Write a protein that binds this ligand. Structure first.
Ligand SMILES: [Mg+2]
Ligand code: NI
Ligand code: NI
Length: 291
């Protein structure tokens, strides 16, 4: 057909059409990675907007991908004619039938107008306590996650939309402290079971100053190690829960565990004073977060 999803990609390849003219998937992904990283640095310096609507969501995407994709600012239900003449649009997405699916066609527009409508009615979530703000933000975040409004680049732009919404509303949501894996599990939990607990946990860790300082400390230790924790879920221990694993070493404010490929982080003062004395790296330890 004239308007086809196949028109997003170079023929015979799996690699999206790009402003660089690169057809090798790996080469393209490296160039994109480099360019979008520069865009973030500048985007994080621009002033906050007055309105947080989809126009702003689009501005972000447009600014991030201006040098990579011709359709940078564009939502995926709106037919887009490339410079080369072909016209593309992906209303569907097509998961496997058994997977939970994103919104189709005009649902994208219904959903997004709704998101704009609620943020306007609630003055961008502005006069609220942290629990009030986090509760409202989680609905909107989950909501926007199921719309998957752009063909690609949803994650980064969604993350920066909310980091900025929070900042404007007098709160924090440092998404840079969340790995790609943790976001994946939290999103999957909500889309499959309707389970909010992982996300609540995620936002809690990202907004509570007492837990943000714990993560900042840990993420620092990764700097110049050669490693990449993006593969690995990094969390602050939930209050009440019990974690068991192997000791990864302490700091001033907090320590780290390894529980089946995941880093759990705890306040140093929650350890029994007498354990801390004789506890070396690699020691098996059970820990329970207090009230
Ligand atoms: Mg991606
Ligand atoms: Ni065609
Ligand atoms: Ni460069």
């Amino acid at each position: 057909e004239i308007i086809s999803p196949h028109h997003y990609v170079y023929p015979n390849t799996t690699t999206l059409k790009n402003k660089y003219g690169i057809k090798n998937l790996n080469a393209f992904l490296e160039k994109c990675s480099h360019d979008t990283a520069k865009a973030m640095i500048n985007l994080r310096e621009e002033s906050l907007p007055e309105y947080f609507d989809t126009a702003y969501l689009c501005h972000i995407h447009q600014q991030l991908f201006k040098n990579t994709f011709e359709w940078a600012g564009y939502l995926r239900h709106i037919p887009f004619t490339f410079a080369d003449g072909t016209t593309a649009a992906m209303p569907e997405m097509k998961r496997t039938g058994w997977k939970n699916a994103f919104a189709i066609g005009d649902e994208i527009q219904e959903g997004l107008q709704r998101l704009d409508q609620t943020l306007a009615e609630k003055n961008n979530l502005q006069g609220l306590t942290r629990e009030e703000f986090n509760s409202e933000a989680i609905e909107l975040f989950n909501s926007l996650n199921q719309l998957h409004p752009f063909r690609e680049g949803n994650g980064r732009t969604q993350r920066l939309f909310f980091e900025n919404l929070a900042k404007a509303a007098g709160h924090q949501l440092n998404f840079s402290l969340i790995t790609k894996e943790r976001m994946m599990v939290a999103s999957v939990a909500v889309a499959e079971n309707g389970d909010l607990e992982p996300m609540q946990h995620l936002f809690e860790d990202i907004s509570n100053p007492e837990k943000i300082r714990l993560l900042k400390e840990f993420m620092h230790t990764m700097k110049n190690t050669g490693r990449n924790v993006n593969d690995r879920p990094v969390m602050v221990a939930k209050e009440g829960e019990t974690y068991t694993g192997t000791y990864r070493g302490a700091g001033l404010e907090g320590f780290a565990l390894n529980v089946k490929g995941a880093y759990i982080i705890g306040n140093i003062d929650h350890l029994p004073p007498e354990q801390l004395k004789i506890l070396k790296p690699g020691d098996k330890i059970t820990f329970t977060a207090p009230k």
